[PDB]
Every structure is written in structure tokens, then in C-alpha cells.
Amino acid sequence: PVTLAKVIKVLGRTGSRGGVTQVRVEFLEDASRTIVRNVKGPVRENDILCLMESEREA
Amino acid sequence: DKAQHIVILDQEKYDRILKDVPTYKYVSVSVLVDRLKIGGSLARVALRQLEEDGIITPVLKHSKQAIYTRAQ
């Protein structure tokens, strides 16, 4: 029960050391439920990183 | 240390080789050492003889790695 989420906007660097980035994800199926979530590695727009749990903001 | 790998080939070990090596998917020096408990030098001589005896087919030849397979 993994969920896939397309990124549409890189918000900005967060975290204490700036090593984690806020990004705005959009689900591939059911193109709604847009969420703000944090991601560790380097991110451009159009990265399909998958989410283990969806019902949580950041 | 704790290794105590056999380096001298007796007749019981000799026939153990000829009875066990044929039932192998992939034979080489390290697989033979790991599971047949023979030494590395004896493994190298065993491979060089087993090819003359026809049990093992050499897929690829190299000094640091000898990849062989069953001939059956």
C-alpha cells in the first residue's frame, strides 16, 4: 500500500541544517489531495518519489 | 587458526571429490574450498585434473578467477 505522488513545486529549504526540502506533491491517480511534504535528496520538478503514507502534511 | 583445511588428498577424500563435484551448479576454487573443505592449491590442481577427466567444462579462463560448470 504505497502511494505515488508527482511533485509540482519546490517550496524551499527547511530543517535545521537545510538538508531537507519542502515540496508540493500531487498524486498520479486521483489528481487531487495535493499535499506539502518534506523530502531529503535533491529534487527538481517532475520527480515521482513514492509515499508510504499520504494522510500527513509537513 | 580455526581453518584446518585439508591440503593432502587421500583416497577417501579423492573419491569424495569425484562423488560430490559432479552434483554442482557452478564449481570454482572458492566454492570447492568453502564447502568441500579442501585447500586452495589442491582445489586448483583438482580443477586442472577434473577438466582432463571431463567432469567440468571451463566457461571462462582467468588467473584470479576460474569459472567452471558441470559437464552433465
Binding site: 518534506n38 535533491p42 503514507e53 | 557452478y26 578467477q65 560448470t69
Partner: protein, 206 residues
């Protein structure tokens, strides 16, 4: 398919190579496909090569690493721990033997097994530290597709290095065992133990 007769004789295998470019003239990229959508754009197998020994120029821009061939990235990550820096020819020889061992064992495309072990070995959620100047704090965060791949490559070679350290089993067949086992998802393998412990902590931090 025709054999072209030259004054300088050209071997048969390389004459079969005009039809197709194959890694070490033995393994074909045609039948290889990533069984996961999220790493397709970051594991580069569309451009075939003969030998994994290529040039650099892939350490300049940000996501240029995703365009480097996955096998060349594996042999690059292999050459680690000081005494091996710069020994690319040794790394390529070991990898070349490793593919043969992965082919003779369990009987499938070896580069399919490398790709499967890499897609199956990168952890999807990692627990980053958020300590505020000394205090212990951990938060579970996601991992970008690029980092999932390059952590997969880091863990497979680290596990092969440690399994072949002070062991009669050679590095080429420790890499072969590590790649096949991680390809089949066995928890016995390194980089599956590490991935499980990481994703377990991430489950215990969100």
C-alpha cells in the same frame, strides 16, 4: 551478419558487434526493463556501451549523474577505501567476472539482476536527524529518486567489500552473491538488512 574480410583480420565476436553493441560483447540491453516506475528516469540503460570504462564529465551539474550508465556507476562506486582509488581497470575486471558468475548462477540476464538489486535495495523512507544543537531528535523524511539509486549503489558495493574482506571468497563472487540475493529480496543480504533497519526506524519516527 555478413563477415567482412579485411587485410587486418577482425575477430568473429567483434564482427558480430556491428549488428549490436553489447556490454563486453556478451550481455544484451534489449531485454532489460525496470520493474518500478520511480527509478526509470534515473537508471540510464537506454544507451548501450561495450566496456564500462568511460570518461567522466558527469560530476559537474546537479542531476547529470542520472545520465551516466548504471554499470559505470557501479564500477565507480566499487573503487573505494584508499588502496583502490584509481584502480578502475581492476574494478572493471572484477565486475566483468561478476556478471559471468551471475549468469552461470540461477540463469537469467545478469544486468537484469544488477538493475533489480538496485531498484530493490534503495530505501524509500529515511530518518533524518533534526537535533537542535546537541539534543537527540529524529524525523522520518522521504528520499528523492536520485538518492534512492545512489544509496543502492553505495550499499551493494559496501556489502560486497565487507563480505570479501579477510575471506577466501573473492570480491567478484561476493558481489555476484550480493547482487543475486538483493535481487531476490532475501533478508540475509547486506543492504537489505540496512534498508529494513532504516525503514523500520522511519516507521518508528513518524
Amino acid at each position: 551478419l555478413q563477415v567482412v574480410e579485411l587485410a587486418t583480420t577482425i575477430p568473429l565476436d567483434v564482427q558480430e558487434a556491428q549488428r549490436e553493441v553489447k556490454l563486453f560483447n556478451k550481455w544484451s540491453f534489449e531485454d532489460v526493463e525496470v520493474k518500478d516506475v520511480s527509478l526509470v528516469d534515473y537508471i540510464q540503460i537506454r544507451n548501450p556501451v561495450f566496456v564500462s570504462h568511460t570518461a567522466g564529465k558527469y560530476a559537474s551539474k546537479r542531476f547529470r549523474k542520472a545520465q551516466c550508465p548504471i554499470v559505470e556507476r557501479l564500477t565507480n562506486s566499487l573503487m573505494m577505501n584508499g588502496r583502490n582509488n584509481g584502480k578502475k581497470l581492476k574494478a572493471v575486471r572484477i565486475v566483468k567476472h561478476a556478471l559471468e558468475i551471475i549468469h552461470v548462477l540461477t540463469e537469467q540476464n545478469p544486468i537484469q539482476v544488477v538493475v533489480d538489486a538496485i531498484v530493490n535495495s534503495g530505501a524509500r523512507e529515511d530518518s533524518t536527524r533534526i537535533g537542535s544543537s546537541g539534543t537527540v531528535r529524529r524525523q522520518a523524511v522521504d528520499v528523492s529518486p536520485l538518492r534512492r539509486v545512489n544509496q543502492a549503489i553505495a550499499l551493494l558495493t559496501i556489502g560486497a567489500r565487507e563480505a570479501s574482506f579477510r575471506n577466501i571468497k573473492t570480491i567478484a563472487e561476493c558481489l555476484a552473491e550480493e547482487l543475486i540475493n538483493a535481487a531476490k529480496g532475501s533478508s540475509t543480504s547486506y543492504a537489505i538488512k540496512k534498508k529494513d533497519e532504516l525503514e523500520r526506524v522511519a516507521k518508528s519516527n513518524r
